């Protein structure tokens, strides 16, 4: 068998990126319904280095897009972030393409390369991902307004708002847009991820994108692995040696073990909450995840949390 030992980057969680937006991780959370499933298309990488969906290697390529648009029009014909063509059934979307569902995207973009000498290069626009012309898998999306000058734009989601034409639905970052196609193996979405069972719940890493939401509260995007983890696996390509990787969350000041977690080959992290009001969301953010040993999908984890005084 192949046996190169499994490692997780030795940096505290405070300093790492979300893998769906390029923003620092502000906390850990459980999903509002701890049985619900996710189908994020970023933050999707196997722990042996195989990225899924649209997951890019680098934070610099995350939640970004690039396409041509002819001046006067609203149709953005996507390519890959580096300019190279995106073929119309190659994947659900070009690499690093945004995967935030149930929201309007309010975008900012500029022409690349630069050609200007005066003026402001930034154009703001917006997308309604639930619209019929939102077909990234066919290599085009339709912006809300016309773009006065046509060319090669690269841009990002600058802020989000609750999704229009959705019956007044709230911003919900647990969902993804409708995109992708069954018509080809490559255009199929990275699959849903379900809680494995065993009383285990999926641990999410939360970060913030600007945007009004219906409750006047943090606008927090969940993902499954910090991006630096994902880039590490892509380099390492450690052999999967068991159905689950036991991890301890360690306080590096004392190398104390703050709790057991299972890291599954599919690229997601679980624990067993102490109770319905406790869980990893109480843990400090300056801790470090450390490989302990390969285990079973049948490994019984110690529960994580407490709540009293």
């Amino acid at each position, epitope marked *: 068998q192949k046996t190169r030992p499994f490692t997780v980057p030795n940096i505290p969680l405070k300093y790492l990126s979300n893998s769906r937006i390029p923003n620092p991780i502000e906390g850990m959370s459980l999903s509002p319904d701890q049985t619900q499933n996710v189908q994020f298309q970023n933050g999707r990488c196997t722990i042996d280095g195989q990225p899924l969906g649209t997951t890019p290697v680098s934070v610099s390529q995350l939640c970004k897009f690039r396409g041509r648009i002819t001046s006067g029009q609203r149709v953005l014909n996507l390519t890959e972030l580096d300019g190279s063509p995106f073929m119309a059934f190659a994947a659900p979307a070009p690499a690093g393409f945004p995967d935030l569902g149930s929201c309007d995207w309010h975008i900012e973009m500029s022409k690349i390369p630069n050609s200007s000498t005066q003026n402001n290069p930034i154009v703001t626009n917006s997308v309604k991902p639930n619209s019929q012309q939102f077909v990234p898998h066919l290599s085009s999306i339709t912006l809300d307004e016309n773009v006065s000058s046509g060319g090669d734009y690269i841009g990002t989601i600058q802020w989000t708002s609750p999704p229009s034409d959705s019956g007044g639905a709230n911003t919900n970052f647990w969902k993804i847009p409708d995109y992708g196609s069954s018509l080809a193996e490559a255009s199929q979405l990275a699959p849903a991820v379900y809680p494995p*069972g*065993f*009383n285990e719940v999926i641990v999410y890493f939360m970060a913030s994108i600007p945007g009004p939401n219906q409750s006047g509260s943090p606008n927090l995007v969940p993902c499954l692995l910090p991006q630096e983890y994902i880039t590490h696996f892509i380099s390492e390509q450690a052999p999967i040696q068991g*159905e689950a990787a036991l991890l301890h969350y360690v306080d590096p000041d004392t190398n104390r073990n703050l709790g057991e977690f299972k890291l599954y080959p599919g690229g997601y992290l679980t624990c067993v909450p102490n109770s319905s009001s406790t869980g990893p969301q109480q843990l400090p953010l300056d801790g470090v995840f450390v490989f302990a040993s390969w*285990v*079973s*999908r*049948f*490994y*019984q984890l110690k529960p994580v949390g407490t709540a009293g005084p």
Partner: single-chain antibody
Amino acid sequence: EVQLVESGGGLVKPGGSLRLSCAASGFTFSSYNMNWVRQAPGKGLEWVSSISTSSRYIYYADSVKGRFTISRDNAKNSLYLQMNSLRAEDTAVYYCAREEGSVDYGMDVWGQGTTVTVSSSVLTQPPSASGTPGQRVTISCSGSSSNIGSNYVYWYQQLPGTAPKLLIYRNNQRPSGVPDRFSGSKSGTSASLAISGLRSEDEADYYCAAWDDSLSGWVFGGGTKLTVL
């Protein structure tokens, strides 16, 4: 209707080969992990082997590593075990069983089996227990650090002659259709099944089972014959 059907076993003799098949219908074969469990006449359950949905993860029992290889073809909806260089110890009914995610991948559905005849346990349970009707009887299951100490204990109920059915997964959860008279518990490296309100229909052979990290496979109790007076 959901069903596994097994074939191709029968009255071989030593050094020989035998290919068993198992046929699934009523559910998506490709969506399920599959095991082989064999059962020597009058002896206990022995987990043989196990293959994951897309054949990526394959495990064997220490006593068949080298001689048996498992395989599946999800197109032809069949599981296979080609058994090679068979000895007398390989004489049993060979069941194929399916793992069901909603019960923590306990074997929820077993076929009727196929008999392979040839001529020329780690978890510890009581061999038998007995109880007068309406009593409570408890059966103990004891193992070591690499099984019960680390992993969830499951419990199988095997009715007189019948193929087994999952009684308890995850130490103490009860599948859909198991009376609450059956509760389960685990403590350190030990576990226990408790049957309260005893009924004549409870007369069966009871097994405990846990994944053993050392062996990298399933590991079964010797089985407890519960007699209902």
